[PDB]
């Protein structure tokens, strides 16, 4: 029917944000990896399989995508942060999980 607020520290919400980040980084024109600063919000609906919409606050790191960094990739002072709306759609009877990056914009 409609969306319901979900907790941004749910272990499943976190996993999903992580996956949405890999997707943002894989598809983004940026040469440098982005990292999640925080999950701003999370909300799920269940009309046809589960649809989860996340807002992620993300920052650039100094980890180049053209590389293989030695560890964690840490957010950097500037650091123009973005907010990306991401929709993740799950249909476990089709064994289906589709992550859609809906929009990113300057925050």
Numbering used by the authors: 6 to 112
From the paper:
Cysteine protease inhibitors (CPI; cystatins) from nematodes have been found to play major roles in modulating host immunity. Cystatins are a group of cysteine protease inhibitors that bind reversibly to cysteine proteases and regulate their proteolytic activities. The predominant target proteases for cystatin are C1 (papain-like cysteine peptidase) and C13 family (legumain). Structurally, a typical cystatin fold contains a five-stranded anti-parallel β-sheet wrapped around an α-helix.
The human gastrointestinal nematode Ascaris lumbricoides infects as many as 1.5 billion people globally and causes malnutrition, retarded growth, reduced physical fitness and reduced work capacity in infected individuals. Although CPIs from many nematode species have been studied extensively for their roles in the induction of immunosuppression, the structural features of this group of immunomodulatory proteins remain largely unknown. In this study, we found that the recombinant Al-CPI strongly inhibited the proteolytic activity of cathepsins. We then analyzed the structure of A. lumbricoides CPI (Al-CPI). We identified the critical segments of Al-CPI molecule that could be involved in the interaction between Al-CPI and its target proteases. Mutagenesis study further confirmed that these segments were responsible for the inhibition of cysteine protease activities.
